[model samples]
Target: LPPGPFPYPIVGNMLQLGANPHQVFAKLSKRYGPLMSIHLGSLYTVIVSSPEMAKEILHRHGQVFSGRTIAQAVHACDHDKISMGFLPVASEWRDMRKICKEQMFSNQSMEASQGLRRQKLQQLLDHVQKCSDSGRAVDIREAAFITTLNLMSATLFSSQATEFDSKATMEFKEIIEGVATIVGVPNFADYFPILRPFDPQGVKRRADVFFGKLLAKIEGYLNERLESKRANPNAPKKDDFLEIVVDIIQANEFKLKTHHFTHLMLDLFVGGSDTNTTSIEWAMSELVMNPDKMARLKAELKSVAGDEKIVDESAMPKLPYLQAVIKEVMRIHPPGPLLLPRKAESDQEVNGYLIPKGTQILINAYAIGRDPSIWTDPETFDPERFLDNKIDFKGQDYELLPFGSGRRVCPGMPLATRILHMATATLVHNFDWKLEDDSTAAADHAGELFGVAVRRAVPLRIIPIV
Candidate 1:
């Protein structure tokens, strides 16, 4: 019924999806035209890869394509629809968006969170020191993830984190990995409408078990904190996000629920950890491969930051080349390779094709960033290209939208960018990075594993500068 590779009785092009759907889809798009359809099980989906096609989907017809199509897993986790990322832009969605934009990501709110960010960076530097002293390899992902998690936990709930070691940290890491699995892959029920009763992958079953435990852990902490805030009349007034929600809930004027708090908490936990940590990982991976760019960035950092000090958000303004490197890395390797899919509520026609209602539309951000027609030598790792270019992640420049565009643009864009810039600049400035293999053959073996996001096949390693 739709233009696709081939469809089995029920399962369609899913076999081609492999373990990494994003990379496979991009290769297919090159063979079939930028504007082509793929069948994920019984679902018919449209993918737009070229700039013109993307513009049509996100700009000219953005209103029709700006809404979200969340799965049952996310729905169960965020029962109140407070997590704006997965919720469509409706009345309730508007309320969540307003609260998140104004109370969390607005200039005032992000500024309030600065001290927490600094403290987290210092803690990260300490961990780096420990690793350096022992000559032990650090999984940057694990370290960055902890920093982001702690930074978010402190800013969102006034929580603290101890150093990572065995016994205590093991279960926490396992729980996080389980939750991550829930977030990364879409369930069969999301694609095939009929699969709801069957529970093929038992996705909903896993989601319930995973999120049930997670929310229990989180709620136990929040409930205790909330009760203390209510009982302590002499306690100093705080300005954390949880305090705001507690105040709003107690007033009864707003229709907030326990799940609303859960939604916001989930948003911060996922957004704070996933996007920033992964972007930093990508930046570091790029640096390992591109020694010239790494050298240039380190030089800039050395000049701005004498001796050794963790670079803060305040220092971000002074580092222009480092900013370019981050931007370039995101452009080349957006963690979310395809902007989250949007479902059309009504029939729409674009570029002379009839896109019926319920067609899942995905903007191929990865392909657009590498669009040969637009970017000269798109495959080459060159940060200088962005040095003179006006393109950015804020979504205005459609050619390079790491955070996407339209009414659904990632609310974490500003914070994510600032974090990436500061973390990357500081790391580059304070260290000398290179591939340990150092051979062209080893470099050839180094590649990326792509799913909804791209991750390095090999670990990125660097030598700390004394």
Candidate 2:
């Protein structure tokens, strides 16, 4: 067993946990070391705060720590059983991940569908254009979220899923946001095994409503598409992810059923969407707060993007400063701050520490990015630090892991970066931005809200000057 802070009679360190558990872990890690065990209520949790220790668990010995700690809320509709996000890293989970890597988020698939995703960016720019023209304040978070949802749905089905202000879009947004929050709710039951029956937090109760709606909505979409295919078997086939998955199901490629299709799609849609969306918002918040950096990015876009004036997926490689800004935003505000929890599959010994089977794991990614030992003046937002460096967030760089690592890494990392880069570029390049009240602009800054994804306490609503 690893060293840790002393636990009280029964409560352990639960009361010591503030609104932010990751931050608390980092503060404790200062004294306890990189790998330290702490009992949260009756649950013994091993918190890893350093990149080396993180790699020790997530990469070097990946499978041993690949188990998931299913939240009580996830038990609704037995979602944990079918969810690619929460399932055990076994056959069903592996097959779903394969579909994402081979078909949904594969390099060839992403390149082939780049045009579809690019089309959605035009919608984002157009919407922002109207706000700029009308001198209206743009809700950065909301606009980014709407664009993300449309981008996701378009990539999945080859058609726009919802309009910016439509009631239908609003309802769909609520479902995604609601479901994301419920699953991550730090319920009393999750920490204390005996409290499971009470569900005092009403976590599962909320899950029942949201998951049912999300599941039904996905199944509804699949049914409509399947029926359309049956209606005209000889019709031209769409070249979207839905079409590919349908092909797999019909061919018995993986013994995937309709329920499997629906659940996978649900995971795909809601899983990485928030991380990308919040990244966009945080990038805007960071850049807007620092106009010099914003100007530097704008200059980069002008010089690199050339005559077209609008940066797109094709120009991504050439725009290093834009990428740097996004990278910094992710470093400062890594979405899923603590990341989804991972549990031990079996008892194991590593670095002379005995980790009991089923011990919960929390890799403090937010803390890692802010560690003074790793980053220079870490609290400062400096995108230039990324320049002249080859570091990236794609699992390998444990210090900057926004998407995580190993078999359980976020499958949609590729899609997220594409959309995030383009979204941030469009906003920075196309218009000048200002807070609603420049006099108290600093006072109007948003706070960080820890949800499924860490978001702005108050969404940065800035007026755009065309």
Candidate 3:
């Protein structure tokens, strides 16, 4: 086994893993080297802490390491069995990815879905403008969440929105976010296999509640689609993404089954809403924290905007400064810190070290982003670092992989790119933001990272100047 810290009898080194497992692994890796081994209770785990070793596992030996360790929290309602995110990298997983590619993230899908993004974004800016006139503060995540949550609805439900500050939509969004929150916490059953049935933390039960309700909500959506189709056999389609899923199922020979649709939709909604909002929150907080960078980015926006009117995703290429700033945000705070944990399919050897099958591999994305060796003065929030470097997070550049580099890279990467850039552009270009004059109530929550997707505390409140 590779060199690692000494393990105690029952607990092993589990006691050392504090709230932030990624940071703890990085600290231990410094002494033990990047590819160190440790016993995580009933599980023997290998922690990969550097880009070189990460590439070795994810790319060079991807097949052997493509297995997934289904988190106990997501195991609720047997979702772990059907979830494409937790399933082993194989044909079944590939089938789901194909459906997603064709219907959701493809180029044609982006073109077709542009109006969905357009209207929601315009709605977001309108609220900010209203806040400006009333001299009220805005929570950045709330606004971003409004846009992101509804965009998912427009894609899946063919509806405009659930109304801002409305309780009905908030319940659905909150339940999904609740599931994500629990998944981020360390479950005892995950480490001690014997404790599986006990569920000491109630992680499984809590997750059961969240997943059960969301699945029910998804069932409603599916029924509505079916009812509409039945009412008028020759009716014109809404051209929404969910309708495409139904089309696939109606084809009969298609591989995906009826059971898979709701679980698939559950995974997609959890990721689509929470992760993008986290990026927007961090981007706004960092830009608001550093006044000059905000000014510099605003100045860049001025050229493309002519001091009026917003630009579309098409304008992304010309706005270099905006691109770099967003990149810096990802570099500083990658949304999904650990990405999903992977398992080894079969025994393998690397750097003269033997790794047995079933060994859990933890890729600490949070550590990778903050590695001083990779970025000079990495702790600093400097967008200029990317101006000439041109490093990307699209799985090619191992050092700056906000998204993991492998067959299992974020399925939503393409759509996420468009929204993150456009949302940040919309916020920065249209108005000036300032920290609320009396923000004492939320000061303690600042600079902390939480959740499976690395969300900050509830909101980053700032006043908007129109």
Candidate 4:
């Protein structure tokens, strides 16, 4: 065992973990050092809290630690078998990742689909402007979620699933939230295999319904696209992920099947949309709390957008301050404070300690980012820290990895980066936000709902003024 509090009988350190385990783990890491091990039920868990340990696990020994410790909830629809995010370091997973890289997330692909994202940004601005004109308080989280969801839909299928403020959209949003909550919540079955069948918390059952509904909705779109293609083979080509996948299947470039494609779509929806929404919401929440920073960002956005009603993705490079603001927000409030759990593929020694095969690995990015030893004024929401620094979340600089590093790094990073900066910059540029009350605006921006992403604990309700 590594240096950690002794486990309490069969429950182990289960009781020690709290709602915000990332913070709790960070505090513990201070006492126990970077590589600390804790037992959760029957599961052997190693928590890595420093940049050095992270590089060792994620880069130096990536092949051994790349395996996922699949959550029981992900087994809801046999998702673990098909999910690119959940699959182990295997050939199929490699092929899926390759397809994503070459076909969907490539610079060429993002360039081709740039217009779709721009249109979504325009729609988001239009909705915000309407609220501004009417003097309405916009629920920033809800607004951002809708835009992100539709942006993803448009990018993947060339169709927007739900419109802003529509009942269907709200229902869909709830389902996605349900899925995120179910999958992200720690499950006893994951630790102690004995609880597998019981699903004591009903997480698996609830996840079943959520995944089924969302997949059915996506299946409907798949069916429609198949019908459209069959009806008119000569129809103008649509440059979207769905079409790209279809093209790949037609060419038989990979051994991907229709079901594989459908599950992949579900992965994109469940993985992509909420994370982007949470990131934007958190970014806005931070900016709102730090008014001076917000003002500086708005000035940058206005200068670059140049009287345009909306800022486009092409303008992102020019808005260095806006980009810095995003970096600061993620540094303080990483969407996934702990990257999705990894599993040790084989027993090996790490820093003189034996990390047995199947030992669960957690890289505490939240703790690493806030480590006083690594960051100056770590707790402060300061965007200037990144303006001149080469450190970035693109997986290279261990100091900041809102997205995980190495082979398991987020494949959707290219798209997510563009959406995050554009969505945030557009909101700050187009309208001014005033918290419902000045006092509440000063309320702790640190209050977060820990889930797949760290979301604002309270839905940010602020008046938008043009």
Candidate 5:
């Protein structure tokens, strides 16, 4: 009905998707046009292509599109109130969004937490320096993940944090990784309502155990921090963002309950943590595969950072070439290839196609990034294209929606942009990287697989050429 491949009764073209949903969506777009729909069991998903349609879904129809459908595992584990990516356009979601928008992710808040971001970036450099001093190949992925988690933790709570070495941090990483994996692939029970009881995929069982323990640990930490703040009313209230939310709850102006806190924590932890880390690793892998891009980026870093021990966020604006490299990497490998799907609040139309109310919409940001119509040489890893165009990752430019667009756009954009640039520059400047085998011939085989919601290409290991 929405202009798509016809649906059968049970599977409903589910087999067409294969394992990689993105590839199948890409193939369908070739035949059905960008604005198309497909049915997976009873669930109907609408996919959007052109930037104009993307803009409409993100902005004009944002309210409806903002609604997140409950997943079987998430509903079972969270009791259907998980606000991060699951809560719809309602008061509950608004409260959580307001807290993040103000105290955690605002430009003012970002400025206040600038020093902490710098500290984390510096620790990242130190790790690379230590690795270089020892002449070892660095697993950039693990290091990047540690830095991301540390930053998220340190920023969210006013506590002592090192980039590495914390038991809770380790546990958090493992649990979060499980969530990412569970969310990416479809669970049979979620689609086939009748099959839910049988627990064919074990989605509910696994999520209950995974999410329950993870939340308990988080709540314990949060309560401890809240109590500490209560006691030390006079304690030198450090500038960490969490202090503000704790203050709100302390005052009783906002009903900041435990589950509410967990939802916000879930937003910050699962949403921000892995996406940033995976993108960093992917960018580095691309640099490793495309030596020309890597060399050019390294030269840019040297010119801008100039033997500085660490790349500072303050130096970001001056390093256009480095920024371009980051852009190119995002274009080729956006962390969320298919952004969190949007649901139409009411019926909508784009050109001739009619989108019915309650239909789920997915804008393939990854496919749009590589769309040949918009990009001259879509597949190549060329940062130079950006030299002439000042387009950026913000919602303003449709070509790159890495942070997404409109009211629902990622609030952490400023923080992520700064951290990403600083981390990337430091990694490139601190060491000379060589692909593990030095087999440039294997560069063509670079492809990605997913063990989690976010994708992972074969990790390109690099030796420090220092």
Candidate 6:
């Protein structure tokens, strides 16, 4: 309909989108222009590639594109009904966003929980030191995954969650991975409404188990906290995220009930943990591949952190080079290659093209970041480009949006910004990293896994020298 190649009657362009749709769509956008339309099965989908089109859809008309096409897999435990990520722009969704902004991710709330995150960073450093001492290659992704999970649990559960490498942590890791895999997998049910009830891929079936396990795990923590609070009403309250939300629930601020609260917990755990770990893993992979850049960043980290031995969040502003590296990493490898898909709420014309109501919308952020028109030598990993530039990824800069913009922008931006910079700085600040085999590291970064997030296909195993 919008200058795309003619689609087959039934199957449409499903066969054309190979393993990595972001790359495929980018190539197509180059030929068809940014506002082209493609058919996937019987569904009419619009691909918005350029920054102008992205701004028009995400910013100028955010309300029109605020609808989400919930994946059948997400309906696993009826999570779509409650997840702020999947809910259409409605009253309940609006209320949830308000609660998240004021109670959980507010500036004051994140400041109060900063100490817990620091503890997790220390745990990560200690774990790496142990690997250094043993002369063992550390699996960078797994280690970061453990650290991210611990950080999130500490902020959310306070004292209820286990440390990294614990049996409980391992179980939670497996479940999150399972859920991410299922959620990212392309299910035919989504393309063909008729197949939803049948669930040909069995994704929904597996999702139910994964969702149930995660919900139960979080429920256990919340129940324990609730019991403790009941026992000691006068006990001094902790400054964790869970305490904040519990207090809000008790005050009947958002009409939040236990199930709604538990679902919110589920969203935070799944949304926060997997994406952060993937971003860190990809960032590390990029650094290991480019030693010169890595050296430059290490020097910056040393200059800023000094004799502190560890770089803290407060040091992020002082180390501009470290921040640039993270921005470059995300530009090259966005955690979510395609921002969570949006649905057109009503028929709208963009750039002289008609986007009918009910059409699925995909903003190809991965492709937009790589667009040569906006970036010089876009293929190269050059943090220097941003050194003197005032551009940032906090939604305003369309050229680089690691997080989507407008109303649906990632609410966890503040927390994620701190974690990515601090964690990456800490990793390279005090120790030297070498790939188990340089060739292997290159191979891993070259071959990426495209799922709910894009990550290194092979785990990065490197020896950390202190």
Q: What is the Å distance of residue 242 in model 1 from its true position?
A: 2.0
Show model 2 residue runs off by greater than 4 Å.
Answer: 307-309, 438-446
- What is the model-wide C-alpha lDDT for candidate 6? 0.84
C-alpha lDDT of all candidate models, in order: 0.72, 0.83, 0.81, 0.84, 0.75, 0.84
Compared with the true structure, what per-residue lDDT tens digits does model 1 show for residues 193-245? 88777878776677777667767766776787789987997898564677767
TM-score-sorted candidate list, best first: 6, 4, 2, 3, 5, 1
Candidate 4 regions with alpha-carbon error over 4 angstroms: 160-162, 166-168
lDDT of 6 by residue, 325-401 (tens): 98998898888878888999999888778889998989898998899999999878989999988888889988987
TM-score of each: 0.91, 0.95, 0.94, 0.96, 0.93, 0.97
Could you tell me the lDDT of residue 106 within candidate 5? 79
Candidate 6: list runs displaced more than 4 Å. Answer: 160-163
| Tens digit of per-residue lDDT, candidate 3, span 1-466 | 7789999999898888776667788788889988888787878898887899889999999889988877788789998888888888777799898888777678777767777667777777787889989989988877888777766766666766635555656887788678777876778798888889899999999989998999898888898888889898998877567787778888875666787888888888777887888888899888887788999998888877775555777777888888899888998778877777788999999778899988988787778888888878978889988887758888888888787878788888877888888888888888888777545634623555656667665578888887
Backbone clashes per model, in order? 0, 0, 0, 0, 1, 0
Q: Tell how far residue 306 is off in model 6, in angstroms.
A: 1.5
Off by over 4 Å in 3: 233-236, 307-309, 437-446
lDDT of 6 at 352: 79
What local lDDT does model 1 show for residue 432? 58
Error of 6 at 330 (Å): 1.2
- Tens-place lDDT per residue, model 5, 237-312, is 7777666766777677665565777666766766778787888888887787788988998888888778786766
Scored by lDDT, model 1 comes in at: 0.72
Q: Which ten residues in a row have the lowest lDDT in candidate 2?
A: 160-169
Global lDDT of model 3: 0.81
Clashes of 2: 0
Q: Could you give candidate 4's per-residue lDDT for residues 357-425 as a string of tens digits? A: 999999899999899999999999999998978989999988897888987999898888888987887
